[model samples]
Target: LQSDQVLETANRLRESGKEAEAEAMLRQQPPSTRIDLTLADWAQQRRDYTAARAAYQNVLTREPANADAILGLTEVDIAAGDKAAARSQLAKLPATDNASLNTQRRVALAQAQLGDTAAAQRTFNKLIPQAKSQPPSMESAMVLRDGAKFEAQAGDPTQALETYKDAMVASGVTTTRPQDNDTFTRLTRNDEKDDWLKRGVRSDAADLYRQQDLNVTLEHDYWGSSGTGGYSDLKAHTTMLQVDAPYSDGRMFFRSDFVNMNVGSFSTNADGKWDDNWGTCTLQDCSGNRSQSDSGASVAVGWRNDVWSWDIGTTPMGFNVVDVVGGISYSDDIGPLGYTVNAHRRPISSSLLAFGGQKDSPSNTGKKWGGVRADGVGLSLSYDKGEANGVWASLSGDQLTGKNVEDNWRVRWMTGYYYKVINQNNRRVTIGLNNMIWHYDKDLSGYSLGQGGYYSPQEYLSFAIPVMWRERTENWSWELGASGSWSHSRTKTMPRYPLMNLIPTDWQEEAARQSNDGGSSQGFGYTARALLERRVTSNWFVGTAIDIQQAKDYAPSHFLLYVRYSAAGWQGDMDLPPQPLIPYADW
Candidate 1:
């Protein structure tokens, strides 16, 4: 038979799924660009990148400037996971302006593989006019498929779905493979069903919140403190309603919260104040043990766009002292690194003494305490590649202030690295290492005079190993996560009133008599969390999440149940839940 007949036979075998036999048959033909190019494509499809690279090089050996051979070799590098080599080769491509249609298509594929989504989109933009002007064919279908994949990877699922359908139409494909069906579902739902539970579990649901849907969420959150070191045993219950309405290119978000704070009975006698009893304190006022309950509501409104989000509002309106509260954030990406910078003013909702101040008595002599607010700026950065490994870090500093509480400051830093151990379409398991460090100007974790009524140690450090498992189905998504942590903290002695010098000399004398001795602690702790979401309908979702942590003298548990509604219809499982609008302090 002629060389052409041999090539034809090899193609028939390859089309029949006998790849090894086709490859063997192709080897029997004389070395030529067309024969070697076909071999490269077959080897690459089988993920035998080494053989594919060699085959492409054979074509390039005779025709040095052959665009197809060079492009094939670049694709082999990409398939072999050598992005650097592929990027270099793509950069060296002769300008695609005058290149063949197939050559330009391959260039776009290389660009998409290198995360240059914009460049890939531009290349497709130039190719689509010519490709679509022709009758629907496999060639046009291939171009549209590449475009669809590019859009999907670029985070434009809406456009991807349309393009994918167009590809099927062009190719006259009436049926799709299972994997193709899954991809179509992902594009239709924006992969939200698979993303919602994990995003809600690991981080905020900003992505879900920013979608082109009117989203409303009602959440109830509860937290209880262990109350050590003369601190109040505080229990807080918060109910919040959040609404997000999509606008022109952004969303308007509103949050309303009703918080109920309760503190157990705690004495303010001389012993409780100074840890030393003062004899016969009848002349000077000394209050006995007291318990109190405070409730208040707050409102905030914000607007969020792709790059910026800002909100403004007031602290709990009915509190002893209401203060302005708000935040502004900027988010963007620089290369593969994404970051968010925020400046915020928020109430410290740790205890009654921290969030809404406690009054000793209803009348004239009652001393009021608590109602602290934290004013701060923070920055968070992440380098993440889905289905792979990632790293994240955050740093923040806050100044604490209140009606009569001591002015203080704190600096905190956290960093983590996560590896995807199991990454499938419907399931994911990740393992990570986390580290956190915090330093406060003083130890003011008490409700007494000058205390901040929050967890404020001079220095705190922790290291943790965390594992997470997430899975999803057509109607449900859930996550289970746990972490083992080693923590150390040190507290330094502090005056009863850090701002005593600003008060009367008589008050200074009284403050001098009271002081807290510092201490240190080190221990191993564990944290566990579970989250689940159910899609009840096309536009409604219900979810519940629980978090529990056990550390030295600091065992706290949190429970959250939220119902979410979306104005738009969803085709499949819900991936993200609404952001649990609990407390800024808790975050």
Candidate 2:
């Protein structure tokens, strides 16, 4: 008969109490744990203790450290009424064998049954404590199993049950996962009253807070112009020096930047209103050659605690101060949620210091350098809630008033949400969406919408879904993300209620096409983005991102490529960069 037929026929008789018939059938076949365990179990049920013990020993000999077989022999010995034999059956196994923890639990308990009391109790009490730890490792789980069984035998059922529930996770079995500790920082952006030059240079201020020692960052960008709107080509670069020193209760922070800047000469011809921002920095250079050298920065001192952060900075137009800023930001708990709020008082005046031969224009009211000088009291506020690992959201708003900057009054709001899709081990995937809107009480020129000033009210909305994945190790990490979006732009027709608004429509059509994002609106457009980042070394990271916008000409329809690099190292206690306290201004 075939093995299946023999086992089936044998089991039919064995179930009716003829276990010897089952044992004899299995003996005709070569030994294998699968077949032997079945025969051994039947023999044990029949109380043929000798056959059961031999079958279990045969499995342990072949598998040599099989937790299953070792555990089974102990049970067989216990049932046969020799508790000492049960305990000794496991003693031959290595105590340090990772798999032995399971068999060890059985043997120690059998010894406890022998009334050694103190020694066996000592074995378990010591085992349990070593099993307790965070993100329970596989080894820790094995130890916990030993401890839990000991507790159950010692009549301490409460602790046994508690650890029994925990052992599954510690054992690295079932669906248990520990928290991930690997993380990287992200960038934050600022919203301005206007877009003057066509160059695209950006620096994230939020990165300043994560500084651990002496730090520095330099950046550059090129915004290609198709020889349109009078822009030949524009490029800009920026640099910053930072120091974070430990203080009594918090941290003492300082920052500054430098510039030997350059600007190409070009004039924008739009709807008949000619504009120029390109010029030389020094008096002699403006008259003969090209390029400009200029500088500007914000100096601030702040105190930070778990709940609050305060900073005050000046744009130092000397006594001609055009801008001064201060903000109070806070982070706190709201119920089971994480919440953050920020409020800033950013008042700006008409910059009156345009040194050298870079001035004089048709509409030169409050004008600076060459572009319109916008003066306003702007307030930017935002709120963030929850961490992205689960569910989270954020809100942003603007309360801005101006004399001739962006608007006399303005309202801006934005919100977003993120949710986790799946997480296994230290790898995770998440999805997110965000939306924004803006409304202005007056023209962007800060002029009466009725008489003069281009009707500049910008309203933008977009919906996107993104998937991000991350994998982390002790010293290495990687992040990958992709996203797609449906975006649209709509600028309401500035009612002629201003009757005679000094709007560009008054100048001419293509005659006024000097970068009027406020001109007309478009339907839906598509955008896609891809991101990759790698942790190259302990304190260094390298990454690049590419974004494509199929949005209309009004939106970002071009491909945007961005790259970044940053480094941080210890200072103060080692041979490090000194803390330099100097002043700076960027214009």
Candidate 3:
């Protein structure tokens, strides 16, 4: 028969490193043929469960009671992490008195993956002796290999070694090639590894390998703020490149960012007073507009493991005061509850004024104003039961400080709970209730010399209902999230220059004359966001995300696009794009 001819050619093509060509040759064969089974096997090896499932179903469509096709479908379900589906499929297979050795071996594999250890052991026990009685051949060798792999995974190293020895003897080979060795070489040799292969669970090992690859990503982000409440047409464009490398038990990551900011020009000072020396005005000439463009660069490095994470970074170096910044966190589980404790020092990036101490105008470069940083510590607790239900809470306190800016304190707390309304293989929907409260020591939300250029309300509260929908396919995935809320906030009037004492002795007299006029608001608020990802190839992925929020006094929108490249091909669903080490704007 020509069966072996095409299969042999496909195998040769794979061995020679033409994987795509090998798959193409097999696919070129007509459907509903033996070649379809071979194609299914090939797709399974590549971890393409969707394609493998389709091919196996094709074979079964023509041969309704085909044993091999049924078993292959069961294997695909198991590999795809559908244990219940696999059990159901396996139950439909008809029993035969003269079951082939390969048939029994497939059953043993399915039993092992489905966690039916006892029955899998019984099958292996019967098959190993039967395979040993056969003449020397690859068929007998493979049967013995499967039995050995099962033994190794089942925690019987001694028996596994014996079975592997039998496999080698049956093949009549003095030395084994990589293709022939399978788990045998790793079981015998000592190698530093991150996968579970040392335990002989090839599927889990493959997943670990896929995640450990060196990854590189490029991203661009745009943020826009509503021009109201002393805030102008504030906009920022941030571009970033990141690299992550897996080390022993953790990852080392580095990122670099370039940011450009824009704000509507104004001739008056931050107080909106028409002073001759304020903003771009020169000697009573207030007709000219102020410069609106500013740019900077920043970089960060970090290392993270399952339990601990730490990073060291910088505020934009192009700023007037380039300060060191970073964060550290520790995570652990207590029974069904998981928690994290963290501390951080980071810039308050709301505008050019808040991010890096900007001059009132491009021409007023003598004295810089309005840069702030927050030092905070936080504790968060979470409880999740798979996809059905979850709850989370967080509490944090921070002290904001900057040159020429009034020092302020803030406290924030948030809690949320969600229930999965719909959970399916490719689609999910969740609904949740969320509450947030914020308190600030002072109202310093203006862009004056002493103001911090960030929102700081004496008291603020919000309650919301949040919903999310997610869907994933073999090559594409998307998510949509929305929230609606009622919010209330109050701001108390205070001294315009609370830090006047820090000013020059001569200027403190005039600064004392200035005063702040704060306001309050209560209203309905809402937010929405969407994210999408496309897997163009095994190692290449592209994604985009957009988010917008409306609050009582502040509104902002953000858009991001990114591309990721994996040194080792990805195996499962991709996550949203990574966040910047230092946010370009306050959320």
> For candidate 2, lDDT tens digit of each residue in 1-587?
36566667667774566656656655676745656666766666666667776776677677657555665676767767776777676564455455334455555565576566677787667556655654656556656665655665566655654555555455433344322111112111222331211001111112222332333423232212222221223233334454556443345656553322233443323443333422111111122222323444545566665567776665433222245556777777755666667776553211112211123232422132212222232233333342444444444444543222232444555555666665443456778775655555544321222212322356556666666775554333445566566655556444322322223344434322323234545455555544444444434444434445454422221222222233442111110111122223221
Give lDDT tens digits, candidate 3, residues 1-587: 57667667677776565664566655665644667777667677776777786776677677767777788888878777888899998888897557888788888888888889988899889888888888777677777767876776676555765676566555544244223232333323222352232323333333334335688989888887866322356887888888888764577988888887777655555464344323223322333334556778988888887899998888877876668888999999998999999999888766667787766533323456667888999999999876688899999999988877878999999999988898664677889899999999998876665677778989999999999998776577888889999999999988766765444565566666666787788888889988888878767788888888775546568798988888756645444332323352341
Highest-lDDT candidate: 3
Clashing pairs in 3: none
| Candidate 1 Cα deviation (angstroms), residue 530 | 0.7
| Candidate 1 whole-model C-alpha lDDT, 0 to 1 | 0.70
Better of 1 and 2 by TM-score: 1
Quality of model 2 by C-alpha lDDT: 0.44
- How are the candidates ranked when ordered by lDDT, highest leading? 3, 1, 2
Task: Give the per-residue lDDT of model 1 (tens digit) for 1-587.
Answer: 47678677776665577766656655775566666666667777785766676676677677767667778767777877888898887886776567757778988888887888778888888887777666666667667666765665567666655565555445543344223433433334323343332232112212332354678889898887766322466677888898988664577988888888776554564654423121112214444534556788988888888889888888787877788887899999998999999999888765667777765432212556667888999999989878689899999999988887778898999999999898776788999999999999977776555566678978889999999998888788888889999999999988655655333465556657767678898999999988988878767888888989785535568888999987765544456332445554443
Ten-residue region with minimum lDDT total, candidate 1: 274-283
Comparing 2 and 3 on TM-score, the stronger one: 3
| For every candidate, C-alpha RMSD to the true structure in Å | 8.5, 19.3, 17.1
TM-score of each: 0.67, 0.43, 0.63
Misplaced by over 4 Å in model 3 are 1-203, 228-231, 267-289, 361-365, 502-510, 553-555, 576-587
| Better structure of 1 and 3 per TM-score | 1
